[PDB]
From Swiss-Prot, chain B:
There is a cross-link at K88 (Glycyl lysine isopeptide (Lys-Gly) (interchain with G-Cter in ubiquitin)). Belongs to the histone H2B family. The chain holds residues 34 to 122 of 126 of the full protein. Monoubiquitination of Lys-88 by BRE1 gives a specific tag for epigenetic transcriptional activation and is also prerequisite for histone H3 'Lys-4' and 'Lys-79' methylation. Keywords: Acetylation, Chromosome, DNA-binding, Glycoprotein, Isopeptide bond, Nucleosome core, Nucleus, Phosphoprotein, Ubl conjugation. This is Histone H2B 1.1. Glycans are attached at S80. Core component of nucleosome. Nucleosomes wrap and compact DNA into chromatin, limiting DNA accessibility to the cellular machineries which require DNA as a template. Histones thereby play a central role in transcription regulation, DNA repair, DNA replication and chromosomal stability. DNA accessibility is regulated via a complex set of post-translational modifications of histones, also called histone code, and nucleosome remodeling. The nucleosome is a histone octamer containing two molecules each of H2A, H2B, H3 and H4 assembled in one H3-H4 heterotetramer and two H2A-H2B heterodimers. The octamer wraps approximately 147 bp of DNA. One of its GO terms (cellular component) is nucleus. It comes from Xenopus laevis (African clawed frog). Its main location: nucleus.
Amino acid sequence: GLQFPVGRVHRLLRKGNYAERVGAGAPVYLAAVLEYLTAEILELAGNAARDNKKTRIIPRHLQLAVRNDEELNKLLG
Amino acid sequence: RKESYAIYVYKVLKQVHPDTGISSKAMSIMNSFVNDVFERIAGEASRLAHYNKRSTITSREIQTAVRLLLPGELAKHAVSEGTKAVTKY
């Protein structure tokens, strides 16, 4: 049960011209990795939102959450 | 950017914060993070595959690129998310 579709990630890998063929587990692995990183961002961003009583994540909470989480900062700097 | 992941980012946001929304301007920033990481993971996995004279991007080549590109425990928990994910069919 992934929120990221294994189907489209597989198609995005095939049309991406990365290799000849794509293994069946590759879009599964990539979709979970893509889903984990967003859940990591949206949590810290969602935290900073209601830590300001904001009921909506705005670009500031994305900027703050990634920037002072230096793991996410070294990734999306 | 190139591909839209907005609905999938909407999916996970309700799992993490069901009562906290996201702006459209921030959703565009979220969509840019995913598009950037997607091409980095898939790009390095293709370099890893092309190098070992491989014609198949598998889950181990994706797993390696995740280890090389994501820093700290970002890669630790991402590899855990990936290996658990393919462990279902």
